[PDB]
Amino acid sequence: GHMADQDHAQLLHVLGIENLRRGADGNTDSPFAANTDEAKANTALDSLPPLLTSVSGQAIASATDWEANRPALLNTFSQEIYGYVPGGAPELHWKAGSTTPIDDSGTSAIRQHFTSTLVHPENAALNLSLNFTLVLPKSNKPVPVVVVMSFDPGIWERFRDRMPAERYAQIQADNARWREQVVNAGWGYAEIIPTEFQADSGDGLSQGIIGFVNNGKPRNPTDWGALRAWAWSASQVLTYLQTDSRVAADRISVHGHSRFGKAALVAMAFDNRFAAGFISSSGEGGAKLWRRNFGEQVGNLAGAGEYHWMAGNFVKYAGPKKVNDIPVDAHQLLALCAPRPVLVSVGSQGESWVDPKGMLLAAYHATPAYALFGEQGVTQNELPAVGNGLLAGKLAFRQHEGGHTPAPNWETFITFATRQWA
């Protein structure tokens, strides 16, 4: 849309940036196609920022030192990468309807819809109606709940009449399956559609929650973008869930896939109340190291089509700065989740855009922070055989046998979280 283009252009003007390097293309016949040749993907890894040097420039030698550095390290991710949550972000007050059984079987599993209304003090066109759906298995005790970020299912339906049908059937089956796997494990889930909180476009940056807080004005370059706002939305659901006696307050997980996998990891790192993370095929801007040249590139995320995911400040790393200059990398983002358990998940079929091994490497290079806490992580720097999970530490990696989908790793994640919480 033209508004994304206009805001992007004004952002470059505000940072004093003439040109950005192009992003990569995904089709291999293009001159700009992404590198997928492992031999050409590691030039920048020598500038990898030292995980265990604090922002003050001291050596980090203990769990205590890592926690003392955490706010400063988060602050760098806020100003330069994902943006600050403004203090003006409001409290969400939720109203719930009645519970209804999830199916007519006589299960005691229930569904309940929650709504929060925000009236803007100045401009009613910024008003918001925000939602999540809670699903709980029946239990005599508080149950774990995974906060789930989903793609708007109105999208599968808009295109039901135009899809191969084998594939529509398979998406619908996967969508039903994880819901059943969660409940059968004695977990509930709390589902949000993130794009109802903040649109997935620069067009919407003056709308949604970012626009509400900004009174419909353009972002300053240190303000949150969409990933951080989606993570904030998940965090507000966790805040509700910790007031609900049906929920185990120390076993609220977060999950998202693809662009929501990026957001879920941002949530995991920034909100240490989340008890476990299922981070699926997140890629560039998520668990993939920026300094890998493999699949999606910084120029993709600094460009008009995806910059809205990021702080405005981030686009400088595609222009007057290079990937080598990013003050942090994805191993520090995973490290920020320590000591809490995180599964980095990716498929094996058609996943080059997210760089399976660059995510592995992020976990590998994050692990010395988990080690400070007496915990284990990822200890090899090459991909295991597909399907062989590195599942023993609090920081874990499993590449499954499928494509760009989380469905083959829900079983692994639920089992993993249960074992790591014991």
Author numbering: -2 to 0, 27 to 445
Provide the authors' own sentences about this structure as they appear in the paper.
The aim of the present study was to investigate structure-function relationships of TtCE15A, a novel CE15 enzyme from the Gram-negative bacterium Teredinibacter turnerae. T. turnerae has been isolated from the gills of a wood-boring shipworm, a mollusk that digests lignocellulose in marine environments. TtCE15A has an α/β-hydrolase fold similar to previously determined CE15 structures, consisting of a three-layer sandwich with a solvent-exposed cleft comprising the active site with its catalytic triad.
Three TtCE15A molecules were found in the asymmetric unit, with a Cα root mean square deviation below 0.2 Å (all atoms <1 Å), indicating a high degree of similarity between the protein chains. Like the previously determined bacterial structures, TtCE15A has three inserted regions relative to the fungal CE15 structures (Reg1, residues 122–134; Reg2, 175–200; Reg3, 399–415). Although being shorter in sequence (26 versus 40–45 residues), Reg2 of TtCE15A forms a much longer helix compared with the Regs2 of OtCE15A, SuCE15C, and MZ0003. On the ridge built up by Reg2, multiple hydrophobic residues are found on the side facing the active site (Phe-174, Ile-178, Trp-179, Phe-182, Met-186, and Ile-194), whereas the opposite face is more hydrophilic. At the N terminus, TtCE15A has an additional extension (RegN, residues 27–55) consisting of ∼30 residues neighboring the previously proposed xylan-binding region. The serine and histidine residues of the catalytic triad found in all previously solved structures (fungal and bacterial) are conserved in TtCE15A (Ser-281 and His-427). However, the proposed canonical glutamate of the catalytic triad is absent (similar to MZ0003), and this position is occupied by a serine residue (Ser-304).
